[PDB]
Each structure stands twice: as C-alpha cells, then as structure tokens.
Amino acid sequence: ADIKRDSYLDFDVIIKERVKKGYRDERLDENIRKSRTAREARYLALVKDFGIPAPYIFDVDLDNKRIMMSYINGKLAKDVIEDNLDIAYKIGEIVGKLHKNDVIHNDLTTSNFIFDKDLYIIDFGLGKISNLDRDKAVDLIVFKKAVLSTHHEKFDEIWERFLEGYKSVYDRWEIILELMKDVERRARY
Template identity: 35%
Template sequence: MAELTLIAKGAEADILLDPDWNGVKAIIKRRGEKSYRLPELDAAIRRSRTIRESSIIHRAKEAGVPTPLIYSVDPDGAQIVMEYIEGDKVRDIVGRIGPEERTRLFREIGRKTGLLHGAGIAHGDLTTSNLISSGGRGVFIDFGLAEMSDEVESRGVDLNLMYRMLISTHYEHTEELFTAFKAGYEETLDEAQEALDRMNEISKRGRYVERE
C-alpha cells in the first residue's frame, strides 16, 4: 500500500496524492471536518458538496471542458478520487510565461469557460488557482462551489471573480489577460455579452464602489 502525500491543503479540503490507486496515480480530495462549524451544519455542507462536485465535474467534461476524470465518490466520507493532472497552477505561471503564451492560455480558458457556462454550469470559484496548465490546455479543477445554473447572475459572478483575481493577484497584466479571456469567452457562448454586462453590474454591488 503506497503512502498518501498531502500535496495541497485547500481552505475546504485536503488534496492527497495516491501514487498507486488501483494501478493509477490519483488525487484524493477529502473534505475534512471543520471544527469551527457546528458538526450538524458541517456534515450537511460536506456531504452535499461532495456529491454535487463529482456530478458537475462529469457534466463539464461532457461539454468539452477539460476536467479530471472521476474514479470514485464517497459522500459520507466526503471524499472524491480523481485523475492526477500533470502541470502547474495558472496562478503560478502567469508571471513567468511570455506575453504570447499568456494571451493564448487566457483566450483558451475564456473559450472553455464559455463552454462551461453554455452547459449550464457555474464554477463558483473561478480563480487562477483552480486552473492547471497542462500540455497547453487549461484544466478546470475544484468544482467545490460549482452549481448547475444557466442564470446570467451565476455567470456574472464567475466572471467577476476571475476579474477580481486578475486585479488582486495578477495586477501587472490585468487588462491584457482579461481581454484575451473575454475574446475566448465570446467565441463559445452566445449570451456572452449579457454575462459580461452582469459582471460589470456585480462588481459595482460591492460596498462603496463608484456608481455611475
């Protein structure tokens, strides 16, 4: 029995690497108990998020969005076993890849986000920490807060979070990256403009934003 390695400790879950899960290299996502939350509330949140996440990852794949393969799901243990994706977090490589590659990658991510939204899925935590650059593709991970929704509001929230991430973390390239993302997004989603307009509206809902 191979040893599990903790490769990431997310806010919500531990990500463990199993080098030999029935013969394959696999990721185990385990939603640990949150001792700050009431056990009853905690169990309900962890269970429902585990089921929802695995089913949404699968649906995203059907829509042509690169996501890890699901190997096994355990709702009561709040655990999902899935494919290990080789590559780096987009968050970590933005600063070290060239402008051309950067633009290409974000356009591709925009395209896939359009496909995701077109399939009625909102990611819920669309940040550059939840995208892995693998073989030139942007693989979408962590669907922990995703929901089935084709509401323009959920799409706008996704876009707003991505934009906010570009402002807070990738502030040197914010506009360049978002322009590329937007171009890709508009290619694959017919209602892209509506979602982008909503994003602008949502960003103004924060407290004390300049109102027009």
C-alpha cells in the same frame, strides 16, 4: 480538502478529502461537506460532457466525504499564466461552453486551472446548476476580482484575452458583460 497523491499499479490516484471545519457546527459541517463533495464530483464529471478537459474521477464516497480522481502532474494556472498569456484565452474557451450549458463555477479564478499538457479545470467545489443571469454575472465578477488581486500588473491584457476566448466560444457574452458592468458598480449611492 487535503489531497494525497498515490501511484496505484495501473491508476494515478489523487484522494481529496474534505476535512471538517472546527469553527462550524458539526451538523452543518457534515451536511455541507457531503453536499459539496457530491456536487463537486457530479459537476466535474458533467463538464466532460462539454468537451472541457477535466480530471477523471476514479471513485467517490459521500459517507467518507472523499473523491479519488485522476492525478495530474502539472503546475497551477497562476504560476504559469505570468509566463504564458495564451492560457487566459484557453480559460475563456473552457468557460464559454461551461457557462453556455448553464452550469456555474462560483469559484472561478486563475489558481485552479492546471497546465500540464492542456488546461484542466480541477475544482468545482462550489459548482451549481442555474439559468440565472445574476449568478453568471457574479461568477464573472469573482473571476475578475481574482485576476485583479492576483495579477494587477497585467489585469487589462489578461482579461481582454480571456474575454476574446470567451466570446470566441460563447455567443451571448454581450448581455452578461453589460450585467457585469451594471452589478460590479453596486457599491453605494
């Protein structure tokens, strides 16, 4: 998943290649890199249909398992959410419609939302299509766990602002929140 930034004479290209993983079978490795780059390209493009800002895709190639997209000269969400709490509200915004159209970013966090001029959702390396409420709930759980393990000091306010933005843009937030409470407690007896 290495990224190389090049300045084409009219294109600001970033080539992201999915390096093979030695610990995995080369058969399954090739299969999963191919399917993953395909899904990432397709979903990161389809999210533009939502109005949700995302990097532009200049080209893809499954055989070479690479995606060369529009590079953004910004900083990570975590490096800026500490000094700016509004991007949690913006994350709620751009996740509300994303969940509304029933496409799930099963890797939601506060580390892959670049802030250069706006909030760019630069990674659907595990995007999926599903109407299942359980998948949405576990995606919310993953995001909450990530924000916990990253900014425990402000988790409460960060999650509250994120939920405010999400309920501002998404309307069925109550049922997914109650499923979040019902599932996050599934530890033991």
